[PDB]
Amino acid sequence: MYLRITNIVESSFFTKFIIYLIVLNGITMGLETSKTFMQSFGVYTTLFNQIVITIFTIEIILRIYVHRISFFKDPWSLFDFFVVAISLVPTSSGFEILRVLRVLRLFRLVTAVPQMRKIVSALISVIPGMLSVIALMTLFFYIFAIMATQLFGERFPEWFGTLGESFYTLFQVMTLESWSMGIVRPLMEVYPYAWVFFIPFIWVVTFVMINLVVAIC
Amino acid sequence: YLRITNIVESSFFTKFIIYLIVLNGITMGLETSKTFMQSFGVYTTLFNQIVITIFTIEIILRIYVHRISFFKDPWSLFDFFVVAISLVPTSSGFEILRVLRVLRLFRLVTAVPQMRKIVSALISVIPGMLSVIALMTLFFYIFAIMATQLFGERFPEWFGTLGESFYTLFQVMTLESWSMGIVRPLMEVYPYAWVFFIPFIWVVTFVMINLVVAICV
Amino acid sequence: MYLRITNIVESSFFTKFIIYLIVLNGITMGLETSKTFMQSFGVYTTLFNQIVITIFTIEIILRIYVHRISFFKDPWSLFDFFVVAISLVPTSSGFEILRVLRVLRLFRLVTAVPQMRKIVSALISVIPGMLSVIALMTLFFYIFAIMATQLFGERFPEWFGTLGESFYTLFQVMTLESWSMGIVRPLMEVYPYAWVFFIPFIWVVTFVMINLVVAICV
Amino acid sequence: MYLRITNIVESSFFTKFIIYLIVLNGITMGLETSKTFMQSFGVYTTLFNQIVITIFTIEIILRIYVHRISFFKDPWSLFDFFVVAISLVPTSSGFEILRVLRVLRLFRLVTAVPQMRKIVSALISVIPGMLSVIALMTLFFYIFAIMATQLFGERFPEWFGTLGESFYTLFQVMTLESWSMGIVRPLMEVYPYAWVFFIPFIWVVTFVMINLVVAICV
Ligand SMILES: CCCCCCCCCCCCCC(=O)OC[C@H](COP(=O)(O)OCC[N+](C)(C)C)OC(=O)CCCCCCCCCCCCC
Numbered sequence: 001m002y003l004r005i006t007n008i009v010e011s012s013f014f015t016k017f018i019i020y021l022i023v024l025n026g027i028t029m030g031l032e033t034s035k036t037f038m039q040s041f042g043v044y045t046t047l048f049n050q051i052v053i054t055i056f057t058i059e060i061i062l063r064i065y066v067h068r069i070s071f072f073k074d075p076w077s078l079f080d081f082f083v084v085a086i087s088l089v090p091t092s093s094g095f096e097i098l099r100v101l102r103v104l105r106l107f108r109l110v111t112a113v114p115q116m117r118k119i120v121s122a123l124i125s126v127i128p129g130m131l132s133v134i135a136l137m138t139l140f141f142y143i144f145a146i147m148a149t150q151l152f153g154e155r156f157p158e159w160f161g162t163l164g165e166s167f168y169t170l171f172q173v174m175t176l177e178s179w180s181m182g183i184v185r186p187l188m189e190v191y192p193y194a195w196v197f198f199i200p201f202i203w204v205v206t207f208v209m210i211n212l213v214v215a216i217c
Numbered sequence: 218y219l220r221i222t223n224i225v226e227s228s229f230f231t232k233f234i235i236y237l238i239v240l241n242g243i244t245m246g247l248e249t250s251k252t253f254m255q256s257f258g259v260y261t262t263l264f265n266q267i268v269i270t271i272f273t274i275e276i277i278l279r280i281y282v283h284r285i286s287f288f289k290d291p292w293s294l295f296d297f298f299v300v301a302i303s304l305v306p307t308s309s310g311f312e313i314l315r316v317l318r319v320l321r322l323f324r325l326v327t328a329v330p331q332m333r334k335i336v337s338a339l340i341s342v343i344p345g346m347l348s349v350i351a352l353m354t355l356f357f358y359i360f361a362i363m364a365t366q367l368f369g370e371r372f373p374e375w376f377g378t379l380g381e382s383f384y385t386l387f388q389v390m391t392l393e394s395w396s397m398g399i400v401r402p403l404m405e406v407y408p409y410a411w412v413f414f415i416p417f418i419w420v421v422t423f424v425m426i427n428l429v430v431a432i433c434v
Numbered sequence: 435m436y437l438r439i440t441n442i443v444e445s446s447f448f449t450k451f452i453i454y455l456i457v458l459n460g461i462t463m464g465l466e467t468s469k470t471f472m473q474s475f476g477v478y479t480t481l482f483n484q485i486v487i488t489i490f491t492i493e494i495i496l497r498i499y500v501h502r503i504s505f506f507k508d509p510w511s512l513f514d515f516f517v518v519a520i521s522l523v524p525t526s527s528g529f530e531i532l533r534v535l536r537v538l539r540l541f542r543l544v545t546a547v548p549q550m551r552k553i554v555s556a557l558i559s560v561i562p563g564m565l566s567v568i569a570l571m572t573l574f575f576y577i578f579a580i581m582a583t584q585l586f587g588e589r590f591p592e593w594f595g596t597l598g599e600s601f602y603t604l605f606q607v608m609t610l611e612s613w614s615m616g617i618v619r620p621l622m623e624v625y626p627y628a629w630v631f632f633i634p635f636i637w638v639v640t641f642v643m644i645n646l647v648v649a650i651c652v
Numbered sequence: 653m654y655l656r657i658t659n660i661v662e663s664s665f666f667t668k669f670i671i672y673l674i675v676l677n678g679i680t681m682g683l684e685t686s687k688t689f690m691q692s693f694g695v696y697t698t699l700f701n702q703i704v705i706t707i708f709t710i711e712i713i714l715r716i717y718v719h720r721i722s723f724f725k726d727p728w729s730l731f732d733f734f735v736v737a738i739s740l741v742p743t744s745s746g747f748e749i750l751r752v753l754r755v756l757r758l759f760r761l762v763t764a765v766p767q768m769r770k771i772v773s774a775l776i777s778v779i780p781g782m783l784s785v786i787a788l789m790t791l792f793f794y795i796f797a798i799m800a801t802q803l804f805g806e807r808f809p810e811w812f813g814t815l816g817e818s819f820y821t822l823f824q825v826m827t828l829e830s831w832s833m834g835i836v837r838p839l840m841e842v843y844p845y846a847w848v849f850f851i852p853f854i855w856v857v858t859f860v861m862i863n864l865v866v867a868i869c870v
């Protein structure tokens with residue numbers, strides 16, 4: 001019976017049939033947005049949702065027995081399981097994030113399609129040469145998130161009153177979004193030397209980011 | 218057949234068309250001034266009717282001379298569509314067409330071969346990005362769904378609609394007011410909103426850098 | 435008698451002394467910012483300023499006769515000449531812009547110092563391969579500045595009421611600064627399809643900028 | 653007994669022991685943030701702080717005599733020394749900034765870890781080929797900070813009323829953050845040709861940044 005199932009799984013019709021349910025339930029998940037649509041075809045949708053998430057469990061089961069241990073060493077296969085299991089976590093009795101993360105079952109399209117795999121693998125190959133840099137940045141953020149908290153968190157609780165709130169504000173300053181008019185110009189109305197903290201932080205952070213972009217080449 | 222071919226391929230012919238381009242280009246840019254259009258309104262719309270008439274003749278001649286070679290030249294197809302657009306009556310129809318008359322000034326890139334190379338150099342890059350662009354669009358689509366059914370209830374203006382989420386997420390991609398404008402307000406209601414957007418901005422930026430590196434290398 | 439002046443001009447003390455006055459009047463121009471300073475040492479500065487423009491008038495004369503036609507064919511010399519001539523325009527009579535552009539005489543440090551010339555020339559060397567691009571962008575902006583004017587200049591005069599006014603706003607959209615919350619989101623409350631105009635405009639403009647960066651890196 | 657200290661210092665446990673205390677007081681320094689935490693283990697922390705900074709004094713002492721002058725020629729060692737010396741400055745005497753700069757002793761992890769040194773040295777190595785440009789950038793800012801001050805600092809003191817205020821605003825304009833809606837659009841409502849000042853300033857500043865990136869590329 002194994003060889004019987006093995007032929008169905010690895011057939012091109014099988015893979016194509018899975019892509020069919022993705023693009024369908026992908027559309028099906030995207031019309032659950034419209035409250036108007038949900039009045040007419042609300043029942044049509046949730047069933048097909050349960051239908052598709054059920055079939056993908058079957059498909060992911062066959063891929064196991066066909067590949068055995070080879071299945072649970074394939075990231076694209078493990079992804080599917082978690083991403084199907086998320087969709088399998090009960091519809092109710094819990095935070096709606098799980099019902100939302102059910103839409104992650106639409107990322108399953110990159111698994112079924114090999115052309116996307118090449119795009120994805122090409123990018124992840126860059127991550128190795130960047131952990132040397134990312135780690136340094138995180139220590140830099142952590143050291144300065146400490147300083148900003150015990151510097152400005154007294155008069156500015158919403159931006160720096162908490163080690164975490166300082167982290168959030170500092171990432172925004174990195175992105176440069178309202179760093180001056182939004183945060184530093186007001187900060188300077190109380191601490192006039194605040195620019196000594198943030199201008200070099202922007203200098204340093206930008207220089208490193210540029211090096212990382214150049215590092216990739 | 219040979220009679221028209223000499224007129225069409227004469228260098229004055231090419232030069233004469235560029236003259237009307239730079240003329241109607243100026244002429245189209247003076248239709249901006251309400252002052253100018255009160256005195257010389259007739260002189261211009263006639264000159265527009267004059268120019269659109271000559272360009273119809275010009276676009277006719279190049280057809281019979283090249284036959285299928287005309288409708289296989291992208292630079293020629295552009296001219297045809299963009300002149301045909303301008304031919305829809307000035308008042309009959311949505312006034313949008315009267316605006317799209319200004320697209321006939323891009324025909325200068327067609328008429329000039331030096332521009333053709335610059336434009337072709339950039340469009341030639343798009344192929345190596347459709348493999349990537351498509352992935353980006355899928356990423357946007359999955360998150361536009363999540364953001365919609367997460368924040369669209371209390372925030373209809375930004376996420377109440379699958380389309381509105383797309384706009385906001387492209388805005389967040391551009392980093393414009395993403396924090397003080399969008400996420401900070403969301404966090405006043407959903408304190409874990411930063412878990413949604415900080416990794417999103419990471420992914421969006423990471424792919425953009427990879428796209429730049431691909432073009433540079 | 436001619437060759438006598440030629441030795442002084444190209445002497446290293448001469449070259450160094452001008453830089454001495456550059457960094458001097460450069461500092462002197464930067465204390466004219468302080469209203470406090472200008473009450474006590476106003477004469478000390480404007481005189482030293484008048485002193486500097488006098489010596490720099492002399493120096494720019496000497497370099498001419500020594501170089502003859504080579505002076506008015508050396509951009510760095512023409513620059514000096516124009517930038518000192520600006521400083522030579524009378525202190526009064528005329529727009530104060532000239533008194534401000536007198537501070538351009540501090541750019542004279544880039545001419546006098548040769549190491550900067552290479553740094554500057556390294557940047558200008560990039561300009562040739564980009565005029566092919568800059569020109570297209572200007573045509574791209576001009577076509578869209580027209581549309582924005584005759585699209586939104588009716589209900590939105592301060593952003594698009596004028597072909598020039600449209601140029602400014604569109605340049606802002608290029609920088610992505612407040613393009614959405616500032617311009618497109620308000621426009622959409624009046625013209626709901628405004629995003630069809632500005633979202634791709636950003637795409638093309640950004641795409642071209644990226645290619646330009648890649649072009650320079652190669 | 654010169655060789656006696658050298659073996660302990662050069663032991664891998666010695667290097668590892670310092671790295672352990674870095675990551676420890678690093679956590680401890682980040683728990684001094686919570687006002688809640690400081691009520692329970694506040695004393696436990698301030699004691700542990702004095703403990704750690706005392707041990708790091710010992711370590712920085714041993715490495716000296718073992719290395720003699722070689723210690724004060726090692727940047728990574730000088731850093732450790734200076735950054736520990738800060739923590740030795742009295743806890744309450746002087747501005748509380750000193751109590752904050754105690755957290756810089758967590759950058760000593762980049763020193764203590766050799767894998768980081770290569771990354772950091774790789775980045776600092778880029779800075780030399782940029783001082784040719786960085787200096788030019790600084791002069792450009794300096795010349796324009798003066799002009800903006802005596803142009804817009806009169807009606808707009810908060811952004812340009814002071815040579816320093818102009819510098820900050822110009823760096824703000826450089827970062828492009830609210831450069832248009834925040835600074836130039838208000839400026840133009842009073843000085844309508846203010847855009848002639850800032851649009852090319854942005855062009856040059858933006859153009860140089862790419863060249864700086866290209867400098868990093870080449
Ligand atoms: C020397 C190198 C190794 C250092 C690694 C140590 C990482 C953690 C050290 C101490 C950080 C946690 C202590 C802390 O200040 O957290 C409490 C703050 C203050 O708020 P608090 O007054 O305590 O009220 C509770 C607020 N709540 C619910 C958000 C927790 O509330 C918060 O903000 C909680 C969030 C703190 C988590 C910080 C995560 C940064 C880790 C960076 C290290 C790299 C990780 C890859």
Ligand SMILES: CCCCCCCCCCCCCC(=O)OC[C@H](COP(=O)(O)OCC[N+](C)(C)C)OC(=O)CCCCCCCCCCCCC
Nearest residue numbers: 188192195199203207786789790793814816817819820823
């Ligand atoms: C991405 C960086 C590109 C290259 C750097 C660009 C050139 C650097 C010039 C920008 C300097 C930062 C602007 C600034 O904050 O100037 C402030 C100080 C004096 O201000 P001050 O009046 O004392 O502060 C009170 C006024 N307030 C409250 C409104 C700020 O003004 C000064 O004290 C003069 C400081 C001159 C800066 C020295 C040049 C350092 C170049 C750093 C290179 C960065 C490497 C990527």
